[PDB]
Amino acid sequence: PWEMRERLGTGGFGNVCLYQHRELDLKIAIKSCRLELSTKNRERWCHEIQIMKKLRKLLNKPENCCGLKESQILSLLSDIGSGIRYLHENKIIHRDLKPENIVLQDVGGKIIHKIITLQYLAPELFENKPYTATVDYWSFGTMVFECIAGYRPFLHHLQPFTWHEKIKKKDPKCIFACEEMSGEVRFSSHLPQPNSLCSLIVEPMENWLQLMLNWDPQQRGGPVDLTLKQPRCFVLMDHILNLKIVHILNMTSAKIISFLLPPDESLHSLQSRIERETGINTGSQELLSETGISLDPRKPMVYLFDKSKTVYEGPFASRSLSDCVNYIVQDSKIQLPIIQLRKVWAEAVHYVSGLKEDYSRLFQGQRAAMLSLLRYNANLTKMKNTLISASQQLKAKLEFFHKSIQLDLERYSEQMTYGISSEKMLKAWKEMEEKAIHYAEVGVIGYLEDQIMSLHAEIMELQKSPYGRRQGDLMESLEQRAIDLYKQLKHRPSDHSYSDSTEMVKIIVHTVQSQDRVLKELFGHLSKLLGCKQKIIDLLPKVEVALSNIKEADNTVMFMQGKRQKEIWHLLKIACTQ
Amino acid sequence: PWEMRERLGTGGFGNVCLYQHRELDLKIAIKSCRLELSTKNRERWCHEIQIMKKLRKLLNKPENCCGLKESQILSLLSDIGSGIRYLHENKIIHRDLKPENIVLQDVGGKIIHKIITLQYLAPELFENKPYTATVDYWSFGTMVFECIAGYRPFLHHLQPFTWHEKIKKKDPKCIFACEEMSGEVRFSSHLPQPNSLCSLIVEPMENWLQLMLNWDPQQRGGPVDLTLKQPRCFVLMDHILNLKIVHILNMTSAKIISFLLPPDESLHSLQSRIERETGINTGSQELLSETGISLDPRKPMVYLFDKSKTVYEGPFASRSLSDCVNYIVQDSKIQLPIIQLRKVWAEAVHYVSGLKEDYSRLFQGQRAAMLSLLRYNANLTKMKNTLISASQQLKAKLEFFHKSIQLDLERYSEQMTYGISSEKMLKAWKEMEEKAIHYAEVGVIGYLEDQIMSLHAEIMELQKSPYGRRQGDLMESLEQRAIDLYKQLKHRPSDHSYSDSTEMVKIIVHTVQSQDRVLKELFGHLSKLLGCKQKIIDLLPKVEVALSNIKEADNTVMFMQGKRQKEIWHLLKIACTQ
Secondary structure, eight states, X not given: OOEEEEEEEOOSXXXXXXXXXXXXXXXXXXXXXXXXXXXXXXXXXHHHHHHHOOOHHHHTSTTGGGOOOHHHHHHHHHHHHHHHHHHHHTTOOOSOOXXXXXXXXXXXXXXXXXXXXXXXSOHHHHTTOOOOHHHHHHHHHHHHHHHHHSSOSBSTTOOHHHHHHHHTTOOTTOOEEEXXXXXXXXXXXXXXXXXXSOHHHHHHHHHHHHHHTOSOTTTTXXXXXXXXXXXXXXXXXXXXXXXXXXXXXXXXXXXXXXXXXXXXXXXXXXXXXXXXXXXXXXXTEEEEOTTSOBOOTTOOOEEEEXXXXXXXXXXXXXXXXXXXXXXXXXXXXXXXXXXXXXXXXXXXXXXXXXXXXXXXHHHHHHHHHHHHHHHHHHHHHHHHHHHHHHHHHHHHHHHHHHHHHHHHHHHHHHHHHTTOOOHHHHHHHHHHHHHHHHOXXXXXXXXXXXXXXHHHHHHHHHHTOOOTHHHHHHHHHHHHHHHHHHHHHHTOOGGGOOOOOHHHHHHHHHHHHHHHHHHHHHHHHHHHHHHXXXXXXXXXXXXXXXXXXXXXXXXXHHHHHHHHHHHHHHHHHHHHHO | OOEEEEEEEOOSSOOEEEEEOTTTOOOEEEEXXXXXXXXXXXXXXXXXXXXXXXXXXXXXXTTGGGOOOHHHHHHHHHHHHHHHHHHHHTTOOOSOOSGGGEEEEEETTEEEEEEOOOSSSOHHHHXXXXXXXXHHHHHHHHHHHHHHHSSOSBSTTOOHHHHHHHHTTOOTTOOEEEEOTTOOEEEESSOOSOOOSOHHHHHHHHHXXXXXXXXXXXXXXXXXXXXXXXXXXXXXXXXXXXXXXXXEEETTTTEEEEEEOOTTOXXXXXXXXXXXXXXXXXXXEEEEOTTSOBXXXXXXXXXXXXXXXXXXXXXXXXXXXXXXXXXXXXXXXXXXXXXXXHHHHHHHHHHHHHHXXXXXXXXXXXXXXXXXXXXXXXXXXXXXXXXXXXXXXXXXXXXXXXXXXXXXXXXXXXXXXXXXXXXXXXXXXXXXXXXXXXXXXXXXXXXXXXXXXXXXXXXXXXXXXXXXXXXXXXXXXXXXXXXXXXXXXXXXXXXXXXOOOHHHHHHHHHHHHHHHHHHHHHHHHHHHHHHHHHHHHHHHHHHHHHHXXXXXXXXXXXXXXXXXXXXXXXXXXXXXXX
């Protein structure tokens, strides 16, 4: 009771149709018979049934055309790296490595990738040579480089009949070829600069690219350690895919610096590392969670605060542009070919989206700092209730105590009138009364209570603060317009070779204007937040020591009254003696 | 060092130019010489200088074309009534009574009117007859009727050459003439129905119109009481301009009922009057200020609440339309002359603006009730702090007390061990300890404290309530469009005799839709407000009696400890005896 849901793809046996039973969601891809395949390859097709039973869409998204995220490429190395390790354990050579053969499985966010066109065709496959797994290595590092470039690793849009002949002329220690608009073929052993990656892993991934893209198949992934059945490629993948790196945005300078983490460094020696890095003293270096929880020093993207610095100035976030982009800043109206234009405009929307994530992370650190302020406020309310409570407890004990000793001095004075009492305990108890009247801490709790309601009024005022995310969605609109202009460029055929880019530069203008606005308002927010936070931190030991003094006069006075009791018991037993 | 500011008006001596010195704001109206007046009337003009040194714009506002407000017409009776009383003391007959001769002086809201065209020309002036102050009476009641009609009291837009001849045929006990579209001349001794006035004063003002507009000058204001140098007209003005009337919107039925106030009625007998009027029992009848302050019963537009009724239904505000307006409801597209159209459309915008003031006053009563809820919340916080404070005072006195008597039972037991103590006060003090342990009211303060934080959470939720005034400004836009359509009708010459009125009926549709919406949301608000208010009112005597019990165990326990003291003094003096 179901139908064909959607034609999934094609194949040598025929087209693939993904099915679904709407009453039961019976999802299955079934490669149908469309090609009328020869019976030899039909038997080999059922062999493929016994063995199989034994992404490019996301790439063509205009956001993704710049290159992918860090953890996306890392998780791609995990899924596809582990997958081809499993396949090379199973003696399998797919010969068909492409993002069109990558199924995306969203398990709650965990995008599990599985395995199921001449630029992925190896040059040994391009001329039908003896093959091995290094072919699939070549396509692997090919595709993973395309995950950050947005394009092929070698002479993009060159026809493979001579493009593979240029592949035969590659410097093997170099990894990337770029061609100028004059046709200048040059090489690079470096990554092209608009990435989204941190250099600390890029350089072992650079040498990894030096291994994975040598066109000699005996050298491509060649140093295979038979200790671990892996090349040095998979050694570096094992290192990097477990290489712990803490990324820290300096909130005070708007700078993210990554850090290699040795597997047993304490957080304090890390504070020494950031201390040497930034100059910020560890007593003033303050760090806390993404959710706004201060980091436990007892433990081994968190956000950097300087306690000893109060007012934070404007951003020290240098946000560069390329000389092509700067050339558009000089004149956006030059009529240049689209080979430049898709690249440069991708760098532009790339740049703007980078600014959006900058404000996004700064927005996060602001919210998290406000959460820490709320926790400090909560402890302030707890010590408030403790203070008011135990303070009025002290006041009542004062009242009851002195009225008690007033009655005791009346009757004791009547016994001194009877020639019974002694004047020494009389004067002593009058000193007890005088020291009780000295215990006049009931004004201090009202004054520091006025400090409490002062700061509580301040943080209630900080609740009603306006937010720059109002202009953050304006940045979303500007970036969205930039995406739309990139799409309108992207669907142009070769007849639309020359174009203008002025409105995008206007989006850059209003972008940096709005970003300066939300940074000024934002730094005003954080400035008042850390100010009132400092007021709370300075307020706490006063409340603590004062409450301690309350407990001092508490146990003091109770001991004094019990002393008065026992003295009356002494005069009792003395009168029992006589 | 100044110039002519603006030409104010005209005159027989010439045009009047209002001056101003921009550096000093030297405002003065100066009647210039434009007419080249004859020297006899120039000498009479300087006579007018010696005697003078001895509004129609507001009428033509489309809001005001329906008729003026209540207090506006009343203040007009005060200023112009008192002014012509002063002028008739000075033997002055102006002969020139018109709103064009009325200067508006805004003293902080108090619009002081002062004294400075054939429909205001009296029929005795129209035929140049012997004159008196009853001429200015005729123009006075003429203009004051025009303040509520928006038009002349007799056959509007009729040419005075025969319109005064129709004035000679007026029924003197009748006050108003209306003409049908067939030309049917009829009379009315009543006010035309679209007023803005309360009938309680209208009927003495109706007979006042029967006196002030009789075309016999010896009868117009004729019964002049020489006891007070006034006609019965000024007697009724003296009554009505001091006639105290409390206007009360029934919030429960969306109805305003006016009330004559005898000059010494207490507020309780007023509650009997509203009690007989509405059926609402005085124990449930609740009244409070415009600013949300409950009315003192000890004293002699406030808003009516029913305490015994919880959920208030939809409005019982009948808002009628005329049969002309209902005829437009039948078909707005009938092509009828503008003599109807300006009147009927004025009734329409009149109706919509009336609905706007309805929601405005209901909005006021909602805000005021919320203010009363805040005051109840404030008393709740005061009793909260008193309760928590004195409660923990009681707890500390319990602790100190029982530890005290624990020490006293230890030593007293040691003296019973010494063969000294008696068991009766032993067992008695153990009963004192047991009753102290019985005093376990520290859980009740936490439970009713949870009720306090419950209601505090509820009223904090009521703070974030959405407001129907969002659609109130939508009503402002709809009414503003209706004003614009009335203006576009109003500037039409006689060539635009036939018109359509459908979009105004659409404004009536969206008006009553939005009004039903804001009344539903509004009554939901007030329903939850009175509900939580009832919760607070029920919560209060629990807190009060519990706190009273705290004071009971307070003075009880203190008396018990002092009793224990005095008993030890008894054993002391007994041991002194032995």
